[PDB]
Amino acid sequence: WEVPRETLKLVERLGAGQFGEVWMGYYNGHTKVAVKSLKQGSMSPDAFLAEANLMKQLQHQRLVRLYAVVTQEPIYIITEYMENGSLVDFLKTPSGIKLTINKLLDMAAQIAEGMAFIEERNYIHRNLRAANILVSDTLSCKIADFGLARLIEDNEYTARFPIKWTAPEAINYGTFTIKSDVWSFGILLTEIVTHGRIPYPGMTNPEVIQNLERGYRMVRPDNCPEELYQLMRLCWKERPEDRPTFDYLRSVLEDFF
Numbered sequence: 001w002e003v004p005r006e007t008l009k010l011v012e013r014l015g016a017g018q019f020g021e022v023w024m025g026y027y028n029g030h031t032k033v034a035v036k037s038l039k040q041g042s043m044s045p046d047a048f049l050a051e052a053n054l055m056k057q058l059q060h061q062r063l064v065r066l067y068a069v070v071t072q073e074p075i076y077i078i079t080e081y082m083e084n085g086s087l088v089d090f091l092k093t094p095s096g097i098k099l100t101i102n103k104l105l106d107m108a109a110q111i112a113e114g115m116a117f118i119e120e121r122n123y124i125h126r127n128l129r130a131a132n133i134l135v136s137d138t139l140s141c142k143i144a145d146f147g148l149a150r151l152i153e154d155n156e157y158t159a160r161f162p163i164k165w166t167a168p169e170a171i172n173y174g175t176f177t178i179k180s181d182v183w184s185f186g187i188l189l190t191e192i193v194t195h196g197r198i199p200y201p202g203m204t205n206p207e208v209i210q211n212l213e214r215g216y217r218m219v220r221p222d223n224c225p226e227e228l229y230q231l232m233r234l235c236w237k238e239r240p241e242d243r244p245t246f247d248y249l250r251s252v253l254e255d256f257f
């Protein structure tokens with residue numbers, strides 16, 4: 001896993017944020033990679049590399065894979081280069097806006113599959129949203145930034161607090177489980193079918209929290225099949241035990257058409 005820095009050549013900066021940068025580069029001369037680097041002092045090396053350790057423990061076709069790390073400063077985590085970057089950005093592009101509902105739900109099904117593996121293995125995501133899904137040249141989706149002890153912000157490694165994906169039990173008591181991820185996934189489905197639109201459009205974060213106290217749920221988005229809306233509503237059941245498993249979500253999305 002540890003590799004010498006000279007095995008890597010960083011070519012182009014993909015983003016810069018509060019805690020570091022992400023670069024496209026090449027590994028061993030030919031393998032196109034993305035390189036996340038830690039801005040010194042943001043957090044400790046061990047806190048940063050925790051993401052890498054989690055990638056090792058959970059390997060799956062729908063999960064971002066660890067290629068290597070560089071443990072001397074600047075610290076690097078290295079993965080496969082994904083041509084289309086973050087799902088939330090890709091959905092807003094010319095190509096993303098033209099995707100059919102069939103293709104959007106195939107992508108949703110891939111995300112549910114990855115989440116079904118995380119559930120099966122008794123882990124949680126905690127940061128599940130379109131921003132933390134990566135998309136390949138063939139439109140295959142991979143889950144990033146899973147299993148962390150901490151809640152991340154989207155401006156840490158690119159230019160841009162997130163509560164619009166957080167289940168009520170997590171807001172009120174800090175209770176995070178796979179069922180709070182199921183909640184987050186329902187919100188992610190709204191991102192998918194609205195070509196990347198922000199949830200709860202024209203509410204601020206405090207207004208969302210006030211509305212959730214009163215049991216508020218988003219209406220059916222314009223581009224949204226009724227059956228897909230009823231799946232979102234199941235994701236957003238107040239009691240976590242009433243929310244479906246990821247196993248179930250995967251099966252319904254895979255067989256949707």
Ligand SMILES: c1ccc(Nc2nccc(-c3c[nH]nc3-c3ccccc3)n2)cc1
Nearest residue numbers: 014022034035036079080081082083084085
């Ligand atoms: C624009 C166009 C393409 C890409 N490609 C890409 N490919 C793989 C990963 C990433 C990326 C974006 N944010 N964080 C990462 C990331 C980088 C290394 C390890 C773990 C996550 N990013 C990113 C931005």
